[model samples]
Target chain A: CSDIWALQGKSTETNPLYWLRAMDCADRLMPAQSRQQARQYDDGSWQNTFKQGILLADAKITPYERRQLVARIEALSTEIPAQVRPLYQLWRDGQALQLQLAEERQRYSKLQQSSDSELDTLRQQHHVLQQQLELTTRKLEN
Target chain B: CSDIWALQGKSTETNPLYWLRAMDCADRLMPAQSRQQARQYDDGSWQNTFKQGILLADAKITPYERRQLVARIEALSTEIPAQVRPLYQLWRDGQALQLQLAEERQRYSKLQQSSDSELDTLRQQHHVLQQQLELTTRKLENLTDIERQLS
Candidate 1:
């Protein structure tokens, strides 16, 4: 049989550890028992034996683990809800950063080009002005 | 023994706040502890008493609870060591964003015909280019020194 695997480090927004822990807890409670076995017995009743959200709410984890779980839950509070505000906020932030970076790079490039152009023009003007002065001096001598 | 669990984000990059305040000094630290224990050790040592690096850092958290600790670390700059450079750099620069997602779905695919073949090829190319660039840059520096000596 193919081994079941929980997604880990799958995104910047999802904690794979939490998912793995949740999956582990689910696995422990449900075991490798077939669906047919899950449907039989009194204490082994699927609905009663496998408590809803028990993996997420398991108290057997260490204090550190508990804290980590709580933190994960808090972070997903908005995303899990039907509210679109968190998604919108993330999109807005990404767009703003992209625009800011683009504008800054463009401005820097333009400034660099302008500086080069100004330097070239100054050099040309200096040469012309010097030549003209030299010509005037020679004409006077003649 | 209590199970060693870590509050990690879904992302590989350690949060800036986590770097500053330390992963242990977050709201999750308090919640992870019993209220009675929290009041006794208000400083968060009780939570760290069991292990040192048991709490793995990442950005793959589905909820804010996992993110709070991860985000705190992400906000900080000192908590993480330099060795995490490869993983965290990919995360910070957003280069590994899709790689992580793709890995999840292709955990057990055939090796020779995997969709990640192109990515693997690109990585190989990158290594080769980096080696070539380093060699060329060193050679150029050597030539520049010889020219300076000649002048």
Candidate 2:
């Protein structure tokens, strides 16, 4: 197993009182095995060092790194919801328009088809009427 | 001045009551000059025909075409927002991380520079101390010789 205390070898500077107190809480939360394995850094805050020691023992990243990573995650969460309401409204309006457009196209197609068919029927009837008129003219001349 | 009546030549079929009624509202909304230029299409609803006439007179596109065009506009409006919320969030997150990383790098640079300068100072001090020790040793040996000669 890796030495959890070795994690503090990089930074030995003492942390603020609040950070140290918070680390105390973190140390208490850690398992006994982790606490025993932890070592204090030279010139380091006991609480900050212990806190880091616990974190390493738990196989987690450093607190600073977590803060950096969580900043982006939280930014996204806050920004998206604030901007999404308008998008949803637009989407709904588009969906409704899409439905209407579909129906409009259907009706337009049906009308075009029926009009063509009816015009053909009317053309045939007109030709028949012309032929009957010619026959009546011939009979009258005879 | 456009031939507003000519716009009705495209579609002569009657629109439904609601659509025709809507067109009446549209007609009333049109300018008087537009109303005079408007003509009824053969077999077309007066309201629908008049509506289109006025629209053409006003240099606007037909309603059907508008509906089609607006669909894409509306789709983009809807889709971009729904999807953009996440992108914005991601962007904000990236921006925050960028700021933090910048600060961290700055601190890292300052520390490295300070440490190197301190180490250089320590090295210079050690060399000066060594030179003084040698000079002191030589002076003490000379005093020893003087004492031996006197004895």
Candidate 3:
């Protein structure tokens, strides 16, 4: 769970608004019958996993809670199809690549701005040089 | 299924290699119990869903198969957590943005090349103008020297 948490830490987990939305979404994921029966008496496993997810969003948690959280997430992942593991891995890798791409885009923007300013300066110098040539030629003839 | 196929038409869906990988991947999703019980007798609903997914990979399929495929995918999607729907939407939007960003990178590279070339040309013109100025100054000085001598 901590490992998955480490991977998911960047996007949705970090965003408080997303956490709120996720909580609201997860509420609906609970079976209607289970929701009525449990009322925190003993919810379905997926609902427990989501509750753990929501709790983990908080900054303050005891060491015991952290340990319990890891156990819960591990248990939650156990029933999922092994084919699904690749999807999680893909999501983690995709986020990392996206971060790198964002940095590259920033670098490109900085490089472009400098290049354009240099071009403007060079063009100005060229015009000044052209006028100097013309004035010098006229002075020489006169 | 074709509707989902339409949305997933890009990236992994279009790539033949991904289809192969997905089939290999989907084969592993079938439950061991069900895999033993039904050699086409009957499988778990999820296994049926995966089978439909694998069959949809084929280029040639009947209209009836297409209809069945849609039914299977719809059934598969039914049990998933509603919270998960946002994830698919996010992925779709992300892919689109990535495409736009790639095109922007190509455009930037082209612009940089043209800008650098123009700068080099301007620099060459500036140097040539400098030489012309020096030549004109020398010519003027020479004429002044002759006039002074004659006077």
| The best candidate in terms of TM-score | 3
- Name the better of 1 and 3 by DockQ: 3
Give Cα distance to truth, residue B22, candidate 3, Å.
5.0
lDDT of 2 by residue, A1-142 (tens): 2332334332422222222233334444446544444434323443343344334333344445434333432333333232232322222232233333444445556655655565565556556555655554454354
- Candidate 1 residue spans exceeding 4 A from truth: A1-82, B1-151
Q: Lowest lDDT 10-mer window, candidate 2 chain B?
A: B12-21
**Model 1 agreement with the true structure over A1-142: per-residue lDDT tens digits:** 1122222233521432233333243445533343333233224322223222234332333434434434443443444322222322222232233334444445556655655565555556556555655554454354
Which of candidates 1 and 3 is the stronger one according to lDDT?
3
**Model 2 lDDT tens row, B1-151:** 2332343321422212222233334434445544444334324443343344324323344445444333333333332223122322222232233334445445556655665565566556555554555565566667667877999
Question: Can you write out model 1's per-residue Cα lDDT over B1-151, one digit (the tens) per residue?
Answer: 1221343443422332232223323223433343333233223332332112113222233333333433443554354444333223323333123333334334323332342464455446555655655565566667767878999
Alpha-carbon RMSD of each model: 22.9, 45.2, 14.1
| Best candidate (score: lDDT) | 3
Rank candidates by TM-score, best first. 3, 1, 2
DockQ, every prediction: 0.02, 0.01, 0.19
Q: Candidate 3: TM-score?
A: 0.44
Q: What would the TM-scores of all predictions be? A: 0.27, 0.24, 0.44
lDDT of 1 at B16: 28
Better candidate by TM-score, 2 or 3: 3
Q: Please write out the lDDT profile of model 3 over residues A1-142, one tens digit for every residue.
A: 2223222433543343343354344334434432342233235554345444443423243445444544554566554334434343333333434544655567678878988888788789878877877876787677
How accurately is candidate 2 docked according to DockQ?
0.01
